[PDB]
Amino acid sequence: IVGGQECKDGECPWQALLINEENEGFCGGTILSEFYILTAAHCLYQAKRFKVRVGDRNTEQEEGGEAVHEVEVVIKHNRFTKETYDFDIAVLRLKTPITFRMNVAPACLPERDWAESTLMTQKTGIVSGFGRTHEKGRQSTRLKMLEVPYVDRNSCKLSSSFIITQNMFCAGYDTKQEDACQGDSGGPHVTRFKDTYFVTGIVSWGEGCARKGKYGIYTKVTAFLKWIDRSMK
Amino acid sequence: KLCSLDNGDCDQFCHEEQNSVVCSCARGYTLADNGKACIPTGPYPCGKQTL
Numbered sequence A: 001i002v003g004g005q006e007c008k009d010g011e012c013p014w015q016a017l018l019i020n021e022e023n024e025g026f027c028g029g030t031i032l033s034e035f036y037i038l039t040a041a042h043c044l045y046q047a048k049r050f051k052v053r054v055g056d057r058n059t060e061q062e063e064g065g066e067a068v069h070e071v072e073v074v075i076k077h078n079r080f081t082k083e084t085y086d087f088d089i090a091v092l093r094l095k096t097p098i099t100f101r102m103n104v105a106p107a108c109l110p111e112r113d114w115a116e117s118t119l120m121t122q123k124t125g126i127v128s129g130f131g132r133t134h135e136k137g138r139q140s141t142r143l144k145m146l147e148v149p150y151v152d153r154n155s156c157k158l159s160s161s162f163i164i165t166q167n168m169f170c171a172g173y174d175t176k177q178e179d180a181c182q183g184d185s186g187g188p189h190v191t192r193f194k195d196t197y198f199v200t201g202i203v204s205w206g207e208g209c210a211r212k213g214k215y216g217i218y219t220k221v222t223a224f225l226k227w228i229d230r231s232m233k
Numbered sequence B: 001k002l003c004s005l006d007n008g009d010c011d012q013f014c015h016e017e018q019n020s021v022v023c024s025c026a027r028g029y030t031l032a033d034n035g036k037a038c039i040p041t042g043p044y045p046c047g048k049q050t051l
């Protein structure tokens, strides 16, 4: 996360981190339920074997809420291809259930029509992660959050060097140096409505980070709500 | 305006049926007696910060 601020105690409880054999995070995810994590399909190609950590805000210090979970099943969307990054979505089922507690809780899945009419027409959503704090920098040891404006769909397609498919949407800033970044990929984009946070996106891709005239591109979760529901069965 | 008017007064999901507002809630919540508010069924309901 470039810019933004720390997730303070209890503020981003649905954050998950995909960690490799070296215990290094390489992608984020979103807690959907005690057994399921939402993430990006493209993240699955960035590590051989990985686990999921939850309840962590500072990777350098044991806070008492951390829990690592092994993955039982990977459910990647069969239509994902690396050439387009279309359908950039996967669900993970964990071997053991997540025990919710301080800093560990699921984000809500919305209904499609309502989310697109009411959530995605809000001014902003919130993205979070342990990713780089600038395009050329190292990964953050602190979990960060960032308010990102929803961006006009036409403006985004005009700004983009790559096709924006029906399964993507854009968020962030034209020139302001705030954005998600590498390492945040797969992580939560949520939208707040009356003090309840709903999953609205998956951090997917962007041309660099916080570049002028470029936006962050997110998987449009509302397009995949039936797919997610099926995968969790 | 119905659901377009302040979310139909619903806490969460709003749908329009027979020119009337119908409210509903995310999994893990129950619709309150007033047919508008959403009440958590158990501990650590989705979408709530843990404070």
Ligand SMILES: COc1cc(Cl)cc(C(=O)Nc2ccc(Cl)cn2)c1NC(=O)c1scc(Cc2nccn2C)c1Cl
Residues within 6 Å of the ligand: A082, A083, A084, A085, A132, A135, A136, A162, A163, A179, A180, A181, A182, A185, A203, A204, A205, A206, A207, A208, A209, A210, A215, A216, A217, A218
């Ligand atoms: C040079 O590579 C990077 C380096 C860094 Cl430090 C960061 C990123 C990145 O993915 N940034 C980013 C920022 C915001 C958000 Cl929401 C997601 N990703 C990238 N990614 C990219 O620039 C790009 S450009 C197009 C893609 C995806 C892609 N490959 C073929 C077709 N498409 C859409 C990526 Cl990933």
Ligand SMILES: [Ca+2]
Residues within 6 Å of the ligand: A056, A057, A058, A059, A060, A061, A062, A063, A066
């Ligand atoms: Ca820690």
Ligand SMILES: [Ca+2]
Residues within 6 Å of the ligand: A172, A173, A174, A175, A176, A210, A211, A212, A213, A214, A215
């Ligand atoms: Ca920009």
